[PDB]
Structures are given as structure tokens and as C-alpha cells.
From Swiss-Prot:
Its cofactor is Mg(2+). Belongs to the IPP transferase family. Its EC number is 2.5.1.75. InterPro entries: Dimethylallyltransferase, IPT, P-loop_NTPase. ATP binds at residues 9-16. It comes from Staphylococcus epidermidis (strain ATCC 12228 / FDA PCI 1200). This is tRNA dimethylallyltransferase. Substrate binds at residues 11-16. GO terms for molecular function: ATP binding; tRNA dimethylallyltransferase activity. Residues 34-37, 159-163, 237-242, 270-277 are annotated as: Interaction with substrate tRNA.
């Protein structure tokens, strides 16, 4: 299987910068995983990296279609698989920056996929009620459900044991099974890494990124797009455009709209963080404790094994 680096994380969380730094230390090339950066003309609302910021590193999947064009998880897979081969073929390191759960797993595994806020409380509450249990008592508990998991996971690795107990309690199904199928249907020798952070910092940064976008001409952009008739298009329905279109007509106030724009952005970021934790096995880097350089070292240590 071909080596592939995957760096997911919320918008402007450093995933983009980190990708380039990794690309510069291992002469690789980046494939944009964002399903919006594919449209030309939509640069501000999508946090599209500029040619200058790319620092020479070549990027793909950016400005490859017009707004009225259609895109999808598989469309991304078809194009990404070709680039990942071409890249490796030229002795380089294929790196995908960004992307959502669907787009990423659809690309990583060859299987058809298959979450209520209530279970969030039940599972979390029940887990916090499991903090009491010693290392072995909690292991026994895991054994009762997933024999295969508790079998190999040593009782002193509380982390992996909770992850298994956590997964079960939510989906109510086999955990060691997702492991198996994902382990066999995997197309690449993936090094999946994600940038994490507390909901507090996350939500605060998002509100701040929405302020900057407005300050950089986001509204002016949706104006040029809506004027070019690109309205009614799938792209114009993405968070950051669908909220502003109404205010351009005068049906909603800028204040109220922006209020909804920062909200949809917060919910979206959350939903994406949730998915990457309950479906993927990502090596999370806590952004609230590491820096661009510190992260590049965590990855450098991980890469000094694959070799």
C-alpha cells in the first residue's frame, strides 16, 4: 500500500500551515480535501490558501471547477486516487490537507458506510461513572461485550479500553469489528493526524474567524457570485454564502445573519470533530498545547518509523 499523510482539523486550525511544513520537510505535494476550495471565485468564504502562502508546494483540487459545477465525495475520490498515484510515481509524498469525514473515509476505505445528542449524555455520564472502576474491573466490563477487543488490549492501557467501551455504548455494536473491516478495506498506509482543541477555544476562534472574513470582503465576494447568477447552485448553499444571500436582498439584517453564520460554523466544526472521533482512528495533536513546529516534530517522529 502507498504511503499517504492525512491532516484533518477545523478551519484555520493550522492544518493548512502544518501540511506545507510537512511538505517542505519531506518534499511532498498537497491534495486539497476541502469540498469547497474546488470552486473558483469562492476563495474567502472557504479559507482558500493563496498561491503565495503555498510557499512553492504544489496544491491540487483547488479552483478546478466553476461555481455551478457539481462535486461529491466520490468525485473527490476518483480525482484524488489518480493524484495520489501520480505523486508517489514521481518519488514524492502524497499529502491530503483538510476534508470531511465522508470525503476522507470514502478515500481511505473501500466499504460502504452506515449519533443522537441524548446518547452523548448517557454515554458520557456512564463513562464518568466508570472512572471509579480500577484498571482490571473496567477491563472485565469491556470483555463482557467485545471479547476480541479486551483480548488483545492489555488492562493497563485504559485509554484504548475506554475507546472501545465508549464506541460500544454509543453505536451499541462491535468495536473490534470496525477495526477489522477498516484494516482490510484500507487503500493506503495512512498516517491520519488531526488537530484538536477544547470546545471553548474552538468556538471562540471560529467567532473570530468569521469576523475576519467579513473584514476581508466576504460579503463583497458573495455579491460578485450572486450577481453572476451563480445563485441556486449547490456551492452557494455552503455555510458562509447561504446566510449572506438573504441579506443581499434585504430580507434579513446583517447582524442577525452574521449571528447565524457564526452559529452554523460552530455547529459544523463540532459535527466534524465528533465524526473524526467516533469513526476514525486519528492521531490527535492538541493545538492548545503544541505549536506549528512542535506538531511538525510529532509527525516527524511518526514518519521516522514508516521508513
Amino acid at each position: 500500500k502507498p504511503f499517504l499523510i492525512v491532516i484533518v482539523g477545523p478551519t484555520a486550525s493550522g492544518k493548512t500551515e502544518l501540511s506545507i511544513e510537512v511538505a517542505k520537510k519531506f518534499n511532498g505535494e498537497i491534495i486539497s480535501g476541502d469540498s469547497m476550495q474546488v470552486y473558483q471565485g469562492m476563495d474567502i468564504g472557504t479559507a482558500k490558501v493563496t498561491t503565495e502562502e503555498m510557499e512553492g508546494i504544489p496544491h491540487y483540487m483547488i479552483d478546478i471547477l466553476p461555481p455551478d459545477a457539481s462535486f461529491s465525495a466520490y468525485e473527490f475520490k476518483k480525482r484524488a486516487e489518480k493524484y495520489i498515484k501520480d505523486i508517489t510515481r514521481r518519488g514524492k509524498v502524497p499529502i491530503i490537507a483538510g476534508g470531511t469525514g465522508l470525503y476522507i473515509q470514502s478515500l481511505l476505505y473501500n466499504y460502504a458506510f452506515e449519533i443522537s445528542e441524548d446518547k452523548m449524555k448517557q454515554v458520557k455520564l456512564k463513562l464518568k461513572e466508570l472512572e471509579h472502576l480500577n484498571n482490571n474491573k473496567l477491563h472485565e466490563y469491556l470483555a463482557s461485550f467485545d471479547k476480541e477487543s479486551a483480548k488483545d488490549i492489555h488492562p493497563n492501557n485504559r485509554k484504548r479500553v475506554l475507546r472501545a467501551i465508549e464506541y460500544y455504548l454509543k453505536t451499541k455494536k462491535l468495536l473490534s469489528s470496525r477495526k477489522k473491516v477498516q484494516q482490510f478495506t484500507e487503500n493506503y498506509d495512512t498516517l491520519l493526524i488531526g488537530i484538536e482543541m477544547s470546545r471553548e477555544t474552538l468556538y471562540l476562534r471560529i467567532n473570530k474567524r468569521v469576523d475576519i472574513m467579513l473584514g476581508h470582503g466576504l460579503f463583497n465576494e458573495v455579491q460578485h457570485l450572486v450577481e453572476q447568477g451563480f445563485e441556486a447552485s449547490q456551492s452557494m448553499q455552503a455555510i458562509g454564502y447561504k446566510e449572506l444571500v438573504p441579506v443581499i436582498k434585504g430580507n434579513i439584517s446583517m447582524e442577525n445573519a452574521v449571528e447565524k453564520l457564526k452559529q452554523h460554523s460552530r455547529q459544523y466544526a463540532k459535527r466534524q470533530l465528533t465524526w473524526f472521533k467516533n469513526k476514525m482512528n486519528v492521531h490527535w495533536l492538541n493545538k492548545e498545547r503544541m505549536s506549528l513546529q512542535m506538531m511538525l516534530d510529532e509527525i516527524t517522529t511518526q514518519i521516522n518509523k514508516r521508513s
